[PDB]
């Protein structure tokens, strides 16, 4: 049996290395990573890899790893795939912990936009979880945390994290993580996967995929929302992605909305994440 070495970037930034038989399906590697992480609520999560364009792709657990990575390195990341709309309802604290680590990267990266006060509040719960009770000894008027909290760090943000951290005395890591999630879950881009596209007139839009449905972000005043029940059918053809929407009270037949993606691969990727999130929705 010939085995391929796999390297997985974990959500704490560390690297897990293991071997799988070269013809292994994704699920084999994923099971090894989740056992390493002591994770039981596995189906919220998945592995990604980067292709030659350095675009992220979900490793399909049902398909051979080699038919997905193809010419690329067997290098993966462990990530949240399905963001729980209600993290309080997860059965295990360790699940909420990994979701916190993913969200911290969502924030620092700018994928999850956040007001100054939300950045500071989330940062304060992370510090409480990571270091425990506020200690003046390792925090002078000039203090700067090791923790990355935001896409752009300022002294004013560091000071506000410390002010809020003082208020959390006696909070355990599980409690601070639950508070972090109660706040993060409310953010307008929580669990939203954004895809670049053009509408049928060639105007640049963003399509967002999430547990509740599909968003068409046209401009700040114009954001079309289609809850999953309103979506009859999804499809891709060449560089085009189509959604069929149930007729409204003033409609006789369904409507079709068409979108132009950059390339055939970007259309197929969008279709697959839509199908997957639609199934997640049907499980809620
Ligand atoms: C798709 C999907 C199914 C089930 C669960 C719950 S679990 N098995 O992780 O505890 C999460 C999911 F995201």
UniProtKB/Swiss-Prot annotation:
GO terms for cellular component: cell junction; cell-cell junction; ciliary basal body; cilium; cytoskeleton; cytosol; glutamatergic synapse; juxtaparanode region of axon. It comes from the Eukaryota. It is found in: Cytoplasm, Cytoskeleton; Cell junction; Cell membrane; Cytoplasm. Disulfide bonds: none annotated. The keyword ATP-binding does not apply. One of its GO terms (molecular function) is cytoskeletal protein-membrane anchor activity. This is Band 4.1-like protein 3. It comes from Homo sapiens (Human). The gene is EPB41L3. The chain holds residues 107 to 390 of 1087 of the full protein.
């Amino acid at each position: 049996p010939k085995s391929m070495q796999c390297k997985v970037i974990l959500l704490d930034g560390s690297e897990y290395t293991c071997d799988v038989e070269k013809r292994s399906r994704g699920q084999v590697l994923f099971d090894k990573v989740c056992e390493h992480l002591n994770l039981l609520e596995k189906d919220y999560f998945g592995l990604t890899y980067r292709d030659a364009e350095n675009q992220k792709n979900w490793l399909d657990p049902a398909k051979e790893i080699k038919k997905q990575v193809r010419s690329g390195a067997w290098h993966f990341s462990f990530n949240v795939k399905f963001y729980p709309p209600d993290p309080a309802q997860l059965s295990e604290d360790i699940t909420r912990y990994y979701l916190c680590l993913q969200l911290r990267d969502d924030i620092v990266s700018g994928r999850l936009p956040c007001s100054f006060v939300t950045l500071a509040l989330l940062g304060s719960y992370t510090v409480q979880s990571e270091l425990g009770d506020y200690d003046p000894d390792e925090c002078g008027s000039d203090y700067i945390s090791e923790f990355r909290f935001a896409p752009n760090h300022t002294k004013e943000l560091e000071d506000k994290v410390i002010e809020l951290h003082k208020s959390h005395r006696g909070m355990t890591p599980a409690e601070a993580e639950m508070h972090f999630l109660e706040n993060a879950k409310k953010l307008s881009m929580y669990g939203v996967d954004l895809h670049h596209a053009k509408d049928s007139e060639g105007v640049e839009i963003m399509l967002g995929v999430c547990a509740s449905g599909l968003l068409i972000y046209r401009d700040r005043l114009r954001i079309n929302r289609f809850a999953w029940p309103k979506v009859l059918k999804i499809s891709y053809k060449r560089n085009n992605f189509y959604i069929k929407i149930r007729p409204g009270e003033f409609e006789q037949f369904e409507s079709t909305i068409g979108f132009k993606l950059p390339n055939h691969r970007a259309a197929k990727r969008l279709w697959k994440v839509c199908v997957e999130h639609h199934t997640f929705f049907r499980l809620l």
